Design a protein around this ligand. Structure first.
Ligand SMILES: [Zn+2]
Ligand SMILES: [Zn+2]
Lengths: 164, 164
């Protein structure tokens, strides 16, 4: 309930110990990660990344359509060559339709949001297949694209085989 | 040279020792962070977050305009009531213009990206003030918005005063 106070206090400890000031921009692993904003996922901890390893792109659902701007920059300015797409169990984007979220915006804010496309999905493994195939199909994304489901209940990354 | 193999092996060590499987979806701190995908920023270490604390939204430059979809879902489905925006020193989005990036896509892939907006900025502090002011102005975002510069050189978060 004092979030600004808490994160500044923590950051003061982080900076006292900090030794990574000379890391370059371009990610060491030539890797870009796309995943959800979900609070339970520390990407660095889950994948064993360190500072400088991979670009980490996060949005509600980990949607590749919205990650594309960031992935083109990741490859063209950062030299990344590979994408991993990681959707997860118990994702809010599985539970609700565009119409469902628009009703919540009306109820709570009394605002109309009928022109915002919130990009939910109806099946968790389909959404990973769709998002991998999207990036492979894009003329603006180079290199291999691997899909995963992160299991929030176990801490477990599950590779998907995505064809075509 | 084996990113997929390396992340799966690192994930097997993480899962072996994981016991956070019953964390709820809604973030404990009722907080959304918006920052850059930059590989040198571990958000959890920089801010002192643990799994389940805060939604973390990352894109190229940490731009609020693109983060809005994710922020509305964060607040309306995840109960967050606050936003922290963090841009950083040595960001790619400072250095290069839309024309610069479009030219690189033409030179490297042979593609025309003349109708993709990359969301670059011309001044780091100005980028944070525009982004915070953007979210404060939005009828779709509730709560306080605080803006920061993260210094890649010394691990330091610096709060900006943003007027209006
Ligand atoms: Zn999610
Ligand atoms: Zn950046």
């Amino acid at each position: 309930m004092t979030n600004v106070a808490d994160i500044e206090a923590a950051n003061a400890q982080y900076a006292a110990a900090f030794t990574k000031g000379h890391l370059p921009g371009p990610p060491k692993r030539k890797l870009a990660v796309v995943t959800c904003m979900d609070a339970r996922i520390d990407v660095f901890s889950v994948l064993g990344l360190t500072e400088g390893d991979a670009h980490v792109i996060r949005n509600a659902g980990g949607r590749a359509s919205e990650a594309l701007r960031s992935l083109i920059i990741s490859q063209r300015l950062g030299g990344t060559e590979e994408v991993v797409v990681i959707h997860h169990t118990d994702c809010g984007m599985l539970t609700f339709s565009d119409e469902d979220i628009r009703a919540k915006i009306r109820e709570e804010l009394g605002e109309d949001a009928s022109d915002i496309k919130f990009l939910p999905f109806r099946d968790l493994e389909a959404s990973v297949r769709e998002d991998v195939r999207f990036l492979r199909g894009s003329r603006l994304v180079q290199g291999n694209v691997t899909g995963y489901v992160y299991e929030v209940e176990r801490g477990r990354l599950v590779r998907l085989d995505v064809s075509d």
